Amino acid sequence: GSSGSSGPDAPRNLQLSLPREAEGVIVGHWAPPIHTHGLIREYIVEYSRSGSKMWASQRAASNFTEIKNLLVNTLYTVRVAAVTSRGIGNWSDSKSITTIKGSGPSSG
């Protein structure tokens, strides 16, 4: 219900990055869980703007995903969770990453 016991079920080494060829996008990466109740069907990735009660979760075949449709120069919290035949398990150590507005030259 509410209680929670941190376990290996969830992934590790959560490192959020940004595509140098895509704006308002966040590439969340992680590692496989040390162990799992059963065969891992997939990995869900939930994200929400530091200032917004709206979390968006999506399915990811690999150990990473690409969260597009985001605001540049804005703190975004990402979190991955290992899914099993049953359902979603513990949530990985949520991480924060500040987006950027293009990684090009500076002219004005």
Side-chain angles (χ1 to χ4, degrees), residues 5 14-16 18-19 27 38 44 49 59 65 68 81 83 86 89 91 93 97-98 101:
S5 279
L14 186 62
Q15 274 183 2
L16 313 319
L18 302 149
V27 174
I44 205 160
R49 203 178 75 67
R59 321 307 207 74
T65 195
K68 319 207 152 151
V83 155
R86 193 88 88 77
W91 285 102
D93 287 60
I97 181 187
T98 302
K101 197 211 283 183

Side-chain angles (χ1 to χ4, degrees), residues 1-106:
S2 289
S3 64
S5 279
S6 176
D9 69 87
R12 323 157 294 176
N13 272 336
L14 186 62
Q15 274 183 2
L16 313 319
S17 329
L18 302 149
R20 81 205 272 179
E21 283 196 50
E23 298 79 34
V25 172
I26 293 168
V27 174
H29 282 236
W30 53 92
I34 301 163
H35 209 236
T36 53
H37 191 85
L39 167 68
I40 297 155
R41 292 210 67 164
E42 44 208 305
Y43 306 89
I44 205 160
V45 302
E46 278 171 15
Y47 52 101
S48 166
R49 203 178 75 67
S50 202
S52 210
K53 278 159 274 193
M54 283 71 115
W55 288 80
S57 83
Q58 58 166 333
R59 321 307 207 74
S62 174
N63 273 29
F64 90 79
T65 195
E66 270 150 73
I67 311 165
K68 319 207 152 151
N69 318 328
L70 302 170
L71 316 169
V72 298
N73 271 241
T74 294
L75 198 308
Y76 270 102
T77 313
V78 188
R79 56 174 85 192
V80 181
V83 155
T84 43
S85 277
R86 193 88 88 77
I88 300 157
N90 280 267
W91 285 102
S92 61
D93 287 60
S94 32
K95 289 284 167 150
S96 33
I97 181 187
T98 302
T99 42
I100 66 165
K101 197 211 283 183
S103 53
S106 298

